Design an enzyme around this catalytic site. Structure first.
Site: not given
Length: 628
Positions: A286, A328
């Site tokens: 993330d 990401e």
């Protein structure tokens, strides 16, 4: 710098001489020892490039390696078999056999036991990969839908227990489905123990976050910081109750971890090993761009950020070889691709393709998409895109201004149009989306809404169903691992309740985060419903993708269709794909098709097609032609 052999002798120092002799002959040790020799030089080099002569580097490193050994020793044998399997099969991620799904456990299935009951459906659909949205403890009410973590170990009690999670992972594995979870490593919630203790001045948590006495440095930093949630606060910082300021790239209740402190790396590596030993196959890294900060820079995509991730990679190569990374990075395409590497993140989200799928539906013109598929699709060996149509997040228009300029397109004006178009503020738009984070100071805005809402299914646009098929067809066939936002496969519409819910109303992303629609899933086997048409089309495309070796790998070569509305590309020099993005019939001419075989079977429609004559695609038609 110390070497692998030296560091291994010190790992073994925890054992008595008798115990030690037993350890040194064990199979686990010999495997660990071998992997240490292969992968430790990468770990040392990457950590050296970031921390240099830092006093804490060597002690941190020995501590981490002692943990790595204990973790691998405890690692289940079943996972050890997968370690060996993937170790000798790096391209497992590139197989056309792979089709992924993503869902929230609570929204899609109530709790973890409920998700386990949904596994037979995932098999029915053909999934080999399941991303479960953030599972662990978070503050009540506002938590960025679980992305503000209060505890990396304790499962959100509304979802179940850690025991339920293990059962789920084991059952996914039994069903031939990889488990994919979030590694939320840039920030924790402000209620995380580390955060509290750091702010309270506990010396053990010194320098775990970035805390400043006043606005002097924050104002300095904000000169070059991009604003991610400008609705929530300006720049990169939020004020504590005691007057101090803390680095908060996202919401105010998400505090950025301080990777300039080597102890933070070690802490997160320990968290990574914990997740690894749960049997997680892929960790979603993330917000990868944000893990390094430097005055005068955007504090994104910095070289140290890449090095740290490569250090994490090496830890997995040593102590849990099965565990792969999904990057990401929702950033400039030049930056996106740099996270993707066998020694970095083996896979990564492909926002460029995703954003351009939507662009092309709006403009009816494949120019930008064609450009992207021509110059930005192909990847280094042993890596792959994750190709998607929608996700839990808004859509950002993250195409390159420089690329657009080559085509005589102004990035600024173009994004203005796309934003108006997808929120139904442009004449004749089929799209029913909602604004997200309109930034008055930059003109930037992003778009929320489900795939079905954006193609016109809410108002029963007779083209909607075909548009969904078209977008997914491209994610399924370009090469890379396709990811279905679960619910899309039955045309799930927006949640209209979100905007009046005080826990959600300031975050329009909840518009596209609806619960499992019982009525639509009950209709999926009925070809007279939208749900059934969408499901059948997608399931067929998935069936074709998984059985046909022409889809294998991540490489493509684009095909010049000579029609501004029709995208074309070739897989393995054997599969010729056409997609019509116009709502009118569009033609590829006999002239364009001269070099092709006379006849070719179309896998979408199941008919033989004549390529020595004009080829007219119906509105939004996709063809998958076997040319070899």
């Amino acid at each position: 710098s110390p070497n692998s052999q030296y560091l291994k002798t010190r790992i073994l120092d925890i054992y008595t001489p008798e115990q030690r002799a037993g350890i040194e002959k064990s199979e686990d040790w010999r495997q660990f020892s071998r992997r240490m020799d292969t992968h430790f030089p990468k770990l040392m080099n990457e950590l050296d490039s970031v921390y240099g002569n830092n006093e804490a580097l060597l002690p941190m490193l020995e501590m981490l390696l002692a943990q790595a050994w204990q973790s691998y020793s405890q690692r289940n044998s079943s996972l050890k078999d997968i370690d060996i399997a993937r170790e000798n099969n790096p391209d497992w991620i590139l197989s056309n056999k792979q089709v992924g799904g993503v869902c929230y456990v609570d929204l899609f299935a109530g709790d973890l036991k409920g998700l386990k009951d949904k596994i037979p459906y995932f098999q029915e659909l053909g999934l080999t990969y399941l991303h479960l949205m953030p599972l662990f403890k978070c503050p009540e009410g506002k938590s960025d839908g679980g992305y503000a973590v209060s505890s990396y170990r304790d499962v959100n009690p509304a979802l179940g227990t850690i025991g339920d999670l293990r059962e789920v992972i084991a059952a996914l594995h039994e069903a031939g489905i990889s488990a994919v979870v979030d590694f939320i490593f840039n920030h924790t919630s402000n209620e995380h123990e580390w955060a509290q203790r750091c702010a309270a001045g506990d010396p053990l948590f010194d320098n775990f976050y970035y805390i400043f006495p006043d606005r002097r440095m924050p104002d300095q930093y904000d000169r070059t910081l991009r604003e991610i949630f400008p609705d929530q606060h300006p720049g990169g910082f939020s004020q504590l109750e005691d007057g101090r300021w803390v680095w908060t790239t996202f919401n105010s209740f998400q505090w950025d971890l301080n990777y300039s402190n080597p102890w933070v790396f070690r802490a997160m590596a320990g968290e990574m090993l914990f997740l690894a030993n749960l049997g997680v196959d892929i960790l979603r890294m993330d917000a990868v761009p944000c893990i390094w900060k430097q005055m005068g820079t955007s504090c994104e995509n910095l070289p140290q950020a890449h090095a740290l991730i490569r250090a994490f990679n090496a830890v997995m190569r040593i102590a849990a070889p099965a565990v792969f990374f999904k990057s990401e990075a929702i950033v400039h395409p030049d930056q996106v691709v740099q996270y993707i590497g066998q020694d970095e993140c083996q896979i990564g989200y492909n926002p460029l393709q995703m954003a351009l799928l939507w662009n092309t539906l709006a403009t009816r013109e494949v120019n930008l998409l064609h450009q992207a598929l021509t110059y930005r699709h192909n990847l280094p060996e042993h890596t792959a895109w994750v190709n998607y149509v929608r996700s839990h997040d808004d859509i950002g228009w993250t195409f390159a201004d420089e690329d657009a300029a080559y085509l005589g397109i102004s990035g600024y004006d173009h994004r203005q149009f796309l934003n108006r178009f997808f929120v139904n503020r442009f004449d004749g738009s089929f799209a029913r989306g909602v604004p997200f984070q309109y930034n008055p100071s930059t003109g930037d805005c992003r778009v929320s809404g489900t795939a079905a809402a954006l193609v016109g299914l809410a108002q029963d646009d007779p083209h909607a169903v075909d548009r969904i098929k078209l977008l997914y067809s491209i994610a399924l066939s370009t090469g890379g691992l396709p990811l279905i936002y679960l619910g899309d496969e039955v045309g799930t519409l927006n949640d209209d309740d979100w905007s009046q819910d005080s826990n959600k109303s300031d975050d329009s992303r909840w518009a596209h985060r609806p619960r499992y629609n019982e009525a639509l899933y009950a209709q999926r086997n009925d070809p007279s419903t939208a749900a059934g048409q969408i499901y059948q089309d997608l399931r067929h495309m998935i069936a074709v993708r998984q059985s046909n070796p022409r889809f294998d790998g991540g490489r493509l070569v684009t095909f010049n269709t000579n029609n501004k509305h029709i995208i074309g590309y070739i897989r393995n020099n054997a599969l010729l794909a056409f997609g019509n993005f116009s709502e009118y019939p569009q033609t590829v001419t006999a002239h364009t098709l001269q070099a092709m075989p006379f006849k070719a079977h179309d896998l979408i429609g199941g008919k033989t097609v004549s390529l020595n004559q004009d080829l007219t695609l119906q509105p939004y038609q996709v063809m998958w032609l076997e040319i070899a």
